[PDB]
């Protein structure tokens, strides 16, 4: 029913597969929250102690991880406290390399 085009930089893009921009769609309810949007992709998305292990840590992200929504900070808003919207442009990135 909607459709998110999210952007993956830095270090999280090689994981799903160099995939610089990709898109996400969920279904479940009218008010569907961001933080539904990162579960979405840790779950049907995503599925192995690996990938996913890396970026979320016991249903908490791992401080580091970069996340642009809408050309503004994440924690701007309220991390989760944001309402999703068919037709945004969401974009991740990580600040680490090597070690």
Known sequence: ????????????????????????????????????????????MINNP???????EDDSIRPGIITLINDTDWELEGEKDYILEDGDIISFTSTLHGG
């Open 1 to 44: 029913m909607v459709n998110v085009k999210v952007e993956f930089l830095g270090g999280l893009d090689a994981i799903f597969g160099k995939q610089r921009v990709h898109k996400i769609k969920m279904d479940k309810e009218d008010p569907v929250t961001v933080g539904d949007l990162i579960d979405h992709i840790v779950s049907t």
């Open 50 to 56: 690996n990938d996913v292990s890396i970026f979320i």
